[model samples]
Target: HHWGYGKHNGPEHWHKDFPIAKGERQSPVDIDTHTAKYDPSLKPLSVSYDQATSLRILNNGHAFNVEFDDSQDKAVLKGGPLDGTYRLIQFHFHWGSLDGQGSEHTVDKKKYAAELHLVHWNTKYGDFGKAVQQPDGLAVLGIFLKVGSAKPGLQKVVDVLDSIKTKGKSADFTNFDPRGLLPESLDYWTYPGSLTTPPLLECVTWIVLKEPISVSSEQVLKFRKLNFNGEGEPEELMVDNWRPAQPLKNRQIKASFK
Candidate 1:
């Protein structure tokens, strides 16, 4: 049995195989902005990406990811609730079947059209595999995506969806700068949370942006056309590939801005 975004293997049943699904610091929590305290000590985030480091894009059964060449510090994220510089490993999106709902983390119960995650690994850990086991190993920057005018930065990523339509499919996607996809403001709410997917490692320092980037509805539909099943297997469109909000037990979300 494989894990996926279906009724049989969806988020609800993940705990049966991965007991950590019901862990203390789970991710995709419904963020209550009213309760978030402003931390003056929190510094603004800094991100530098080398377009040459972008390697390829692939559909890994769950979502499409644009991987980077993390062998060196070519693309990195620093400050803003992070201890040190974290290397950019990959970036991916979680979207819904419809525009009304999709985002993993919500603002006062408000769901967006989609959510983007920029996953980074701490350099001290030596590698991503080793980083996931440590408490402060990974830092994931979450950005909300709302439906509105088309975003030029996102157009390039959307255009390659046709080539990687099925699971396990990949294509050359180099010379891409992910920084263009970020919003104007870096204001965010930071907290300790786990990965939204299976294995659900609790090693992430989540930095969710206050502002959302705009994408046209048509562009979101392009993501839905992707197949969760690989070729020669049953066809299942990839949509609603988001895990619902979990409980925010004993956790305080700190905001960079008031």
Candidate 2:
């Protein structure tokens, strides 16, 4: 009985502990091309990531995040509907415990096998923790993951999952370029939304990529092997660690491609 994505304390019940879960600009909303407005004014995404920024990988009982050293502007994201440069912080994923249906954001109401989130914080506002309270403090780049060939970039990360299969487990992981994980196309949809997890801060400007990268069934299955509970507790499979798509409210989905 953990406060996780399950029957007792799932997304529906999150509002009880964190009322911001019912905020106007909640994240992981359905992206429909039919209704999205194509804006030519949208700038192309510019990303420069230093593999040296990578630190370690950890299973925090919720999800595994490849932590990055965001001390400087070594790895940063700019352009593409952003007012200023955002520093790379960490990256994580969410997937279904079963064979299908685990992605947080859906395209035209269709779910991918999983989703990758690259979390960043605006440097103008100082650190990520403090930025969460402001309106434009965070920016999360979303990339969909489909089941197919084993993605070379992702495989490296997957190879180390066994070492961190249990909660609180971690391993030294560095010199991995996050840029290699992105799809060929930088075309994306932009909107204002909150974090998909606890505290549900309404400070993220989402940049969801249109194209999904490929991963093998074996690789995707490795994610489900992670444990949600700590060492002494009964093991709980860490799957479906995704929040359901929230209401669209009165927001607009702006597209970079026509």
Candidate 3:
């Protein structure tokens, strides 16, 4: 009855309910590095997070989201294709059933094990609800996750998955610094795009990190344990929770590096 990654409710079927799914400036585009223009004018992105503001982690059926307090400017993202400060609201991830293909955005047509999105809303737009309707109202920072050695920073998140295994379940999660999840290089490619999920709003300025952070295969397996179904409903693993790349018509991706 709702949107999901399954054959009946997958990306192909989303356009039925959300016409914007076929609109211009859609997200999760293929990042063709050779075709990307390096913009020297672009400033390095800045992110300041107050770990105490992290409130909780919840499974919203689609993905598990770690929400932050956005009432004040406790955590913010600025610079790099952004005008004013954007307050950090929440962050989530999209992954696949297997290790080879879970990422939303692909580089040179290459998909990683998974992808992380840190969602921020423009302060000038008042809040996330109003911001989601503006052209330049949201900034999503995307980080690719590759299967490799265990990541200590990621373990903190994985440790809490057991408490929220079903849809609509949530647990207290605080004092967790999201910055610890970032890759060594801050280099990224930015473009005007939409939210990868429904209502498929085209309000996000996506900044995708070039380098991928490492996570053990075992760690990724734990994410698969999360159920898309509710406690009483039929069981279903929440794997392959990602939308395929959309057309990049009349859009240019700008790189922060040569």
Summarize candidate 3's per-residue lDDT along 11-120 as a digit string, tens digits.
99999999999999998999999999999999999888754389999999999999999999999998988999999999999999999999999999999999999999
**Which segments of model 3 are wrong by more than 4 Å?**
50-52
lDDT at 252 for candidate 2?
99
**C-alpha lDDT of all candidate models, in order:** 0.94, 0.91, 0.94
- Model 1 Cα lDDT, one tens digit per residue, 56-174: 99999999999999999989999988888899999999999999999999999999999999999999999999999999999999999999999888888889999999988999998
- Give the backbone clash total of model 3: 0
lDDT of 1 at 31: 92
Residue 178, model 1, lDDT: 90
What value does the lDDT take at residue 78 in candidate 2? 94
Report the lDDT tens digits of candidate 2 across residue range 1-258.
546887888888988888888889998899988999999999999898854378999999889999999989988999999999899999999999765788999999999889999999999988988989888999899999989888988878988999998889999998888988999999999999999998889999999999999999999988988898878788889999999888999899999998
TM-score to true structure, per model: 0.98, 0.97, 0.98
